[PDB]
């Protein structure tokens, strides 16, 4: 399949995922200066800005590459934050709502 339509699709999909994160809690890396124990629990931080950089660096060449980093955003947040927090529930909401975005986008990629 052709590269350019695939990257256009991933850009649109990433924008749709960011729209689901209405608090923008996943827009940029977790600020390690404020959370010095974060790396004690989380081996690979991820966020939507880093995903955009990876996309434009041609690091995502199949849908799994892209969805893996999305899943890291969600799983890191569930792991680090207590269940009774807004942050934890925001990851649950993103998993549910972003999952639906991802399933339709993957289907578009399969038509290529
Ligand atoms: C997504 C996430 O876990 C966080 C985003 N910002 C945070 C902050 C500021 C502290 C702890 C966790 C987070």
UniProtKB/Swiss-Prot annotation:
Q: Where in the cell is it found?
A: Nucleus; Chromosome; Cytoplasm
Expression sites by tissue: High levels in testis.
**What residue ranges carry the coiled-coil annotation?**
none
The chain positions of domain Bromo read: 1-105
- The leader peptide range reads none
Q: How is it modified after translation?
A: Acetylated by KAT6A.
- Disulfide pattern: none
Q: Which domain of life is it from?
A: Eukaryota
What is the purpose of this protein?
Scaffold subunit of various histone acetyltransferase (HAT) complexes, such as the MOZ/MORF and HBO1 complexes, which have a histone H3 acetyltransferase activity. Plays a key role in HBO1 complex by directing KAT7/HBO1 specificity towards histone H3 'Lys-14' acetylation (H3K14ac). Some HAT complexes preferentially mediate histone H3 'Lys-23' (H3K23ac) acetylation. Positively regulates the transcription of RUNX1 and RUNX2.
Please name the disease the record associates with this protein: Intellectual developmental disorder with dysmorphic facies and ptosis: An autosomal dominant neurodevelopmental disorder characterized by delayed psychomotor development, intellectual disability, delayed language, and facial dysmorphisms, most notably ptosis. Additional features may include poor growth, hypotonia, and seizures.
What binding partners and quaternary form does the record give? Component of some HBO1 complex composed of KAT7/HBO1, MEAF6, ING5, and BRPF1. Component of the MOZ/MORF complex composed at least of ING5, KAT6A, KAT6B, MEAF6 and one of BRPF1, BRD1/BRPF2 and BRPF3. Interacts (via PHD-type zinc finger domains) with unmethylated histone H3 at 'Lys-4' (H3K4me0). Interacts with trimethylated 'Lys-36' of histone H3 (H3K36me3). Interacts with ING5; interaction directs BRPF1 to H4K4me3-enriched chromatin at the 5' of active genes. Interacts with KAT7.
Annotated protein name in UniProt: Peregrin
Q: What is the lineage of its organism?
A: Eukaryota, Metazoa, Chordata, Craniata, Vertebrata
Q: Which gene encodes it?
A: BRPF1
